[PDB]
Design a protein around this ligand. Structure first.
Ligand SMILES: [Ca+2]
Length: 435
């Protein structure tokens, strides 16, 4: 069967759209009036309250704050969600701190309030309507498609991908923020996000699983030029029935990482890797000589970002606040006069602030023994001016130092070395100096 909806065309229920394993009932999208799609424009001049543009009356565009001379980004929420006064609309404000943008928030709350498989259909009209407005800006204003960015969370990711495909891949960038897996994973390219759908497609995977067993709501499948898997892809730090899987912490974490990257450009450098394990074991370190990609907002500055598909990258993120992180390789070589049991720590010191103390080894601490260790510092010190070392066991009172420490930056491979064959009591902060 099939329905038509005017300028948006028709929608059949033929495979692959419906009557497939994952889409077993034969459904069709609701009417545009029912989905009630809306384009909520925010600019630097109206950052807090939207102006309501539409493509069918392009006078609305003109009389809006929309600038032809500025970039334009769309943000598409997914299942059971909205734009007005939620993460899309706040993501606009964030952007307005760092750049001049036309932030359009596709709001289809009504069309996302329905059964999941019915929403998997509505996604399509929502896509059509966005694709229409983008064209509208092109035909009616002379705006360039390679200049539009469409950001999508969950279903919204596939909604971006639908509009992108409507525009025949002319849309310059799609960012997929943990694209929904149910109904899309391992489906044909037409019905889902895939590198074909824009000149540049970047994906952030945060709640990824296969279809069975169902471990989460995101996609394990790589579907962009760049596919980032922060913290391995499956389970993010800071998150502790599958009957609300789409509003789990891991899922929502994707748009928090994105929103953050808008303010912390290098907060989320991705390292190119085959697996998380390879990355953990630091077979994957430091960055390539010609820069790491900046996951999130500044993904588009990556050299050769479009040179291949499904380029895989791994990284670690913080558990709270800005969520930012910066990988360091750290190499302590011990000093002492007697072997002892306890743990070892290191703080990094710039003339910035300094870092919290990070663990490096537990158990058999012996003079002369070295231990090496990748660590995830939560803020950028810049040039490491000093490092401080601390070890801790109850007592007879013995001394243990660090004769030498080497910290390597992941960001650009810089090696620092530090010095002091000179031991200290327990829980005393020992300092080591450049050399
Ligand atoms: Ca597609």
């Amino acid at each position: 069967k099939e329905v038509c909806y005017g300028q948006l065309g028709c929608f059949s229920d033929e495979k692959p759209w419906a009557g497939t394993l994952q889409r077993p009932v034969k459904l069709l999208p609701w009417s545009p009036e029912d989905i009630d799609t809306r384009f909520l424009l925010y600019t630097n001049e109206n950052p807090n309250n939207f102006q309501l543009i539409t493509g069918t009356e392009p006078d609305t565009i003109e009389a809006s704050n929309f600038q032809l001379d500025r970039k334009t980004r769309f943000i598409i929420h997914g299942f059971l969600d909205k734009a007005e006064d939620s993460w899309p609309s706040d993501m606009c404000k964030k952007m307005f701190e760092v750049e001049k943008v036309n932030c359009i928030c596709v709001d289809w709350r009504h069309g996302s309030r329905a059964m999941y498989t019915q929403a998997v259909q509505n996604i399509r009209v929502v896509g059509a309507e966005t694709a229409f407005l983008i064209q509208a800006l092109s035909t009616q204003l002379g705006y360039s498609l390679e200049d539009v960015h469409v950001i999508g969370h969950s279903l919204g990711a596939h909604t971006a991908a639908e509009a992108g495909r409507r525009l025949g891949g002319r849309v310059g960038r799609i960012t997929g923020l943990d694209p929904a897996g149910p109904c899309f994973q391992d489906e044909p390219e037409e019905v889902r996000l895939d590198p074909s759908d824009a000149v540049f497609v970047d994906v952030i995977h945060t709640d990824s699983s296969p279809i069975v067993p169902s471990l989460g709501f995101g996609m394990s499948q790589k579907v962009g030029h760049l596919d980032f898997f922060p913290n391995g892809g499956k389970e993010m730090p800071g998150c502790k029935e599958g009957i609300g899987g789409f509003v789990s912490c891991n899922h929502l974490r994707s748009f928090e990482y994105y929103s953050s990257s808008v303010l912390n450009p290098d907060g989320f450098l991705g390292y190119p890797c085959a697996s998380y394990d390879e990355f953990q074991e630091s077979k994957c370190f430091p960055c390539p000589a010609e820069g790491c990609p900046k996951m999130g907002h500044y993904a588009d500055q990556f050299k050769g970002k479009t040179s291949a598909v499904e380029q895989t990258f791994f990284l670690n993120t913080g558990e709270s606040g800005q969520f930012t992180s910066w990988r360091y390789k750290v190499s302590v070589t011990l000093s002492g006069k007697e072997k002892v049991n306890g743990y070892i720590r290191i703080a990094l010191y710039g003339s910035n602030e300094n870092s919290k103390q990070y663990e490096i080894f537990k158990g058999s601490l012996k003079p002369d023994a070295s231990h090496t260790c990748a660590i995830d510092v939560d803020f950028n010190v810049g040039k490491i001016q000093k490092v401080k070392f601390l070890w801790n066991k109850n007592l007879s009172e013995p001394k243990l130092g660090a004769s030498q420490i080497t910290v390597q930056s992941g960001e650009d491979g810089t090696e620092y070395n530090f010095c002091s064959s000179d031991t200290v009591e327990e829980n005393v902060l020992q300092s080591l100096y450049p050399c």
